[PDB]
Symmetry: C2
Subunit: 126 residues, 2 copies
């Protein structure tokens, strides 16, 4: 299911004009790395991919820090892509995430602010 959904996201990214790839060993890697990397020549994305049955999404500080470090080194924008059962993929720039004392979270107050993929690509033209 998950790889179907992560491939699902890759397919959506390509339909949106990105060339995108899933990262191999994105878990057991010594280096900072996202789950997906995408680019269209203008916009470059480093994406951590999450699926939840319901809100909220919690992420660790480490996972987010590693994402940001990768994105800064690569020359990409750091995003969390979150899928809920009935929803299309929704994209959250890291700044949109809410801080708890220890973790980061997307709950119901933030989820509606998330972006569709076309909005992510459109930011370049403002």
């Amino acid at each position: 299911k998950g790889t179907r959904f992560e491939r699902d996201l890759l397919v959506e990214l390509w339909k949106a004009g990105f060339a995108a790839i899933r990262v191999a060993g994105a878990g057991v890697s010594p280096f900072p790395c996202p789950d997906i990397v995408a680019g269209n020549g203008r916009t470059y994305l480093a994406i951590e991919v999450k699926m939840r049955k319901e809100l909220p999404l919690y992420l660790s500080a480490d996972e987010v820090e590693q994402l940001v470090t990768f994105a800064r080194g690569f020359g990409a924008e750091a995003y969390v892509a979150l899928k809920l059962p009935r929803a299309a993929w929704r994209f959250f720039p890291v700044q949109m995430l809410e801080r708890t004392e220890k973790n980061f979270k997307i709950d119901e107050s933030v989820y509606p602010l998330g972006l569709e993929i076309a909005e992510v690509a459109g930011k370049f033209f403002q």
Copy 2:
């Protein structure tokens, strides 16, 4: 297998050269994608005990298509034993009948990693 071994070696050399780099899992796709904030690379990774390297037209076409879409420079990276990694822009590949190749006449033209990164080497 060894394929992965050489891909992992290159990932380490890319990070050391100032690129953030990833290996690609599994829609044309290269083996490695890297970037340093200004240059982006799409790399097909090969190891041979001896020259020449032959590549299919399809593999090269997919690399080019991905690199065009992504906004990256397309390279074939080739490791021989006891030699540093060398990097060949697709334009440097010799076209054959239906394939592409790197033989002893093309190999010395290949870039080293410092030249790809546009940096100094110690």
